[PDB]
């Protein structure tokens, strides 16, 4: 209850709205652009938030306290907050634009229409190394900074402009991948097709277990965004996981890239490599920009 205005505040005239990105939890997302967000730039391109024109005081609070989570963060591969209009109406929340959406609609995208036409060939093992690196690197950023992610999932990371893929906003939640969620115990909504064997067995999350489901979303990037356990109902994907069960190497998936999965896929949490030991398996084969923007290689790491 009760939203302050802080250092976060953004005067309501220097934000302008222009095209719908789509609809969010509270609202309409929109495209637009931003004077003084990012240091004294006059125009940034941004994604604005906004609360519905007749949502109740409690759910623009809500929607503030939520946003407000993203404060803390400064990470080059995790989606940035970048000001709060809470005076007034309507109530925005301004942030980094991710001009190529989700992950897995983006991957989806790349799949082969079947009409005849010719088709891009699906991402290269290069270009599939560099998107693990930068979620890898979102992830590594946010442990260090003592956060469980709970729900790391190619539809949770965003695609920007250039192509990088970065840890999307959180807790946005409804509407969007409700097949990917499922009632367990007819209880909660659980995104159990990416949940480790301890999270499905007692319900608590670490960074071992962001770790698993950082395994899943290297198999959404080799399949182009297919279901996990496509064949296999929610009920037969607890039973499978629980009792040992894998996902089964991607067709043409390299190797080293399934190799990766299964060293995020070990049964016992701590037997898992943490996400620093991923990128630094995979550092050498980084685009060289990698080493001036990402978390693993700031003073920020240890
Ligand atoms: O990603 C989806 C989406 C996902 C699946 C689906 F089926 N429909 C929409 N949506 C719907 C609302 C906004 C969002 C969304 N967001 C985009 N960019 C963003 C969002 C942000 C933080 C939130 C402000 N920065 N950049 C974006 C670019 C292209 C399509 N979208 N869709």
Redesign the pocket.
């Known amino acids: 209850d009760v939203y302050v205005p802080d250092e976060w505040e953004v005067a309501r005239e220097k934000i302008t709205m222009s095209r719908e ?4 939890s509270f609202g309409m ?1 929109y ?1 637009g652009v931003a004077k003084g967000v990012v240091k004294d730039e006059p125009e940034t391109r941004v ?3 906004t609360v519905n024109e007749a949502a109740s005081m409690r759910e623009r609070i809500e929607f503030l306290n939520e946003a407000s989570v993203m404060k803390e963060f400064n990470c080059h591969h995790v ?1 940035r907050l970048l000001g709060v209009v809470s005076q007034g109406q309507p109530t925005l ?1 301004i ?8 992950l ?2 983006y991957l989806r995208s790349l799949r082969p229409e079947m009409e005849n036409n010719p088709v891009l060939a699906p991402p290269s093992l290069s270009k599939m190394i560099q998107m693990a690196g930068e979620i890898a690197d979102g992830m590594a950023y946010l442990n260090a900074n003592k956060f469980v992610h709970r729900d790391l999932a190619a ?1 949770n990371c ?1 695609v920007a402009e250039d192509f990088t893929v970065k840890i ?2 959180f807790g ?1 939640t409804r509407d ?2 409700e097949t990917d969620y499922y009632r367990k115990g007819g209880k909660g909504l659980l995104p159990v097709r990416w949940m480790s064997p301890e999270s499905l067995k007692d319900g608590v999350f670490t960074t071992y277990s962001d770790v698993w489901s950082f395994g899943v979303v290297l198999w959404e990037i080799a399949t182009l965004a297919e279901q996990p356990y496509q064949g296999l109902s929610n009920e037969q994907v607890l039973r499978f996981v629980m009792e040992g069960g894998l996902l089964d190497k991607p067709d043409n998936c390299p190797d080293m890239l399934f190799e990766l999965m299964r060293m995020c896929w070990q049964y016992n949490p701590k037997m898992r490599p943490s996400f620093l030991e991923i990128i630094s398996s995979i550092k050498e084969e980084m685009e060289p920009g990698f080493r001036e923007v990402s978390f693993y290689y700031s003073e920020e790491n240890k």
């Open positions: 990105l789509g609809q969010g997302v495209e994604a604005i938030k989606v929340v942030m980094e634009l991710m001009t190529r959406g989700d897995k609609s539809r965003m999307g906003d946005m969007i991948y």
